[model samples]
Target chain A: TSSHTVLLIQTSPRLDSRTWGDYESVTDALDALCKMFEDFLSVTYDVSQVYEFLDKLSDVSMMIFNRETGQYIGRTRAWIKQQVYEMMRGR
Target chain B: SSHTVLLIQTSPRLDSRTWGDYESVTDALDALCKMFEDFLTYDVSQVYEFLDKLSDVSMMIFNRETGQYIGRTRAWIKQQVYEMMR
Candidate 1:
């Protein structure tokens, strides 16, 4: 079975309002999701200097890279969770 | 000035060769090792699931239920040497 992987890339400034709350809230949500699914989902980061891969993407705050399928999901935590749930069910 | 910090948590994984393959990843891991007071023992298998859900992120500070402190980067370098002996 292929594992679901995501690479969340952020391209926001350090001192911004929306960026501040979004990161905290999303990561908190991610933590919960990780504990819920355990070994099923895999999340990695670009980990490079900020904006290094900016040209490869559009004007999105967060980009989820699906490693297994080689696709990009520019969506919210709720949406991502929905997709993950569906994928698991289909499997 | 406060420095930004990151925690690269991982558990044990099967393919050990995939461990240090990425230069940038290794550099970031090395930076974390030098910056934090405690030496992080990473087992890719142990941390695989958690990291799979949480990707690259930056933050000010956070306290985990496991009693680990994630905080400023450069500032913690001073605490690194202290942890080496203890």
Candidate 2:
């Protein structure tokens, strides 16, 4: 990440490589899954789609599924800065 | 004195060459390895299992004598350097 402190839990089926090791244990899906992204390097102008995607997740330690066909994509573990997190909550 | 074929790639283009001896390939890879920085990615980190996985900096090796194919990335450059030094 741009900042070392922020852990970006992101993925892309297209990218053959991943930057960090996988977080095997995700304590909370709704809690941690909120920040998961399609790609770690992506830009998030509005978080709705990011958070909105979470609505597509299955319960606990979360697995991402495509919106249609309900296909299971993979597991997610990400955290946003408090500021970005607050935006989703409506500041 | 095994014969080897090498393929080096940059995103926009690829270079193919024939090497007379196997040891010289390591010399060439050492030079190529210097051109890139070690990337922090798991794609090539797994080595043999996921070696072909590409990142901004990646490499592939094919041996004519053994008929083996190998793939790697910038991260692997350091590994080769380390093991050889060891």
Residues B8-59, candidate 1: write the lDDT tens digits: 3233321111111113323444554443324335443423333343333232
Q: Which candidate achieves the best TM-score against the true structure?
A: 2
DockQ of each: 0.02, 0.02
What does fnat come to for each candidate? 0.00, 0.00
| Model 2 vs. true fold: TM | 0.23
**Full-model lDDT for every candidate:** 0.33, 0.36
What's the chain B TM-score of candidate 2?
A: 0.36
Off by over 4 Å in 1: A1-4, A7-63, A66-75, A88-91, B1-7, B10-86
Worst 10 residues of 1 chain A by lDDT: A14-23
Question: Worst 10-residue stretch by lDDT in candidate 1 chain B?
Answer: B13-22
lDDT of 1 at B80: 37
Candidate 2 structure quality by residue, lDDT tens digits, B2-86: 2222233333322221111135547655554444335323333334332244333433344354343343445665576556545
lDDT tens digits, residues A1-91, model 2? 0111211222333222222212333223333444454443345456666655543433212222233422223332233333335645766
